[PDB]
Amino acid sequence: TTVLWGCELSQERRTWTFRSCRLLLHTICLGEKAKEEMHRVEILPPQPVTIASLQASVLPMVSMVGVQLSPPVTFQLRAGSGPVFLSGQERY
Amino acid sequence: TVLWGCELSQERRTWTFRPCRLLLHTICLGEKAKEEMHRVEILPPANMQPVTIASLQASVLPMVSMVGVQLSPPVTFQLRAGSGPVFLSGQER
Amino acid sequence: VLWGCELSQERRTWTFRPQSCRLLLHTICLGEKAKEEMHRVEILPPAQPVTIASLQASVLPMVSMVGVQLSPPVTFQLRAGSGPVFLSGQER
Amino acid sequence: TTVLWGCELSQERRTWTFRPCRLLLHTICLGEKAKEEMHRVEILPPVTIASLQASVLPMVSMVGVQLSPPVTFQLRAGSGPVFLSGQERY
Amino acid sequence: TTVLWGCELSQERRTWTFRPQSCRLLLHTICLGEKAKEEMHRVEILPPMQPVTIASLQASVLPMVSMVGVQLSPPVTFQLRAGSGPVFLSGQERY
């Protein structure tokens, strides 16, 4: 049974934790409100791993369909104001 | 098994798929779409926040290909930001 | 086997026929000769069209959609732009 | 068996042929030394598989395409260099 | 058993080798840091045979790429062939 999953990161709310046997991570997208500075999203333990770098006037968003993450997973907006959205599916 | 497609816009920013599995392939801006960024969401089914699946803009990225996304119906797409047209393609399986 | 086609304002359509009961669609690419306007490629019904790609020379000259499998007959149409636009795939 | 595979195309070497199995093709990338013109890469029996340009799209990923050898790539337009990467399987 | 993997390449560390029944490095994304300057970056894999180029990125053009589905057999040596970075690689160690 797969359920749709999503989150929004920003400078005000820089972190989000998924914490169902696997998180299927599909896309990462900038919101229309996001400033122009490069954005960077990392996954934190339990060093950080950078999974995406995006910029409004250069690369709207990115697809990474196929990535499957083992929970718990913490995302952090390591650089930029956001909003930055993430989409995916929980599967078990 | 069956090809699927839908165009979202200011006139129609919402669409819902019902019949097993929507394979979602690409999302593309139309040549008549104006400059502004466009954002496409999937709404949660009624039973917390819409899930953003694509951000596109004509001068910087006019489409994206997310082959491998497989959605269970009903699925409601919404054109959250932008006037469109924005197209969606995929297959009903 | 390997399969490809070129669409243009002169030749706007290109129908695939004959295993070869599956067309794997891999990439869609603008030619270096395509002019600056946005290009849109749709797939047409046998007997509403579905847009599968939007491209523009100065913004995004190609796209990969490896994984799409289509059931023949498939008719592609260059709905907008003058081309050339190329498609590639693998008859399966 | 799997072995990493790569080749480089350019005006000085327009084509490259892989043969003695499937070639898993991964990415196609412009070199930093490349010029600014649009580059187009074909597979010759031609089928165009990529268009790239340094100031617009310097590479593309094609993880999933599997080719039956022999396979000949051609730099149909542009001066290069253009790199291809993949994996020989079996 | 799968574990998240991530490395950072730069002028400082312009080469990293992932060393070892079985294990595959699943290679997911390669992304420029916001601190990378304007030059083109190119990342190779060096034979444990010439180097193989796997990505070309540039901040003002294409700051990252996804290559989900690439499964590398160790040993795998990554090299930042052109560019000062930082450039980040992400993936998972499987099995």
From Swiss-Prot, chain E:
Highest taxon of source: Eukaryota
Family membership: Belongs to the nucleoplasmin family.
Phylogenetic placement of the source organism: Eukaryota, Metazoa, Chordata, Craniata, Vertebrata
Self-association and partners: Homopentamer, when bound to H2A-H2B dimers only. Homodecamer of two stacked pentamers, when bound to H2A-H2B dimers and H3-H4 tetramers simultaneously.
Site for Interaction between pentamers, residues: 38, 58
Entry comment, domain topic: The acidic tract A2 mediates histone binding.
Locations listed in the record: Nucleus
Organism name: Homo sapiens (Human)
Record's protein name: Nucleoplasmin-2
Job of this protein: Core histones chaperone involved in chromatin reprogramming, specially during fertilization and early embryonic development. Probably involved in sperm DNA decondensation during fertilization.
Annotated disulfide bonds: none
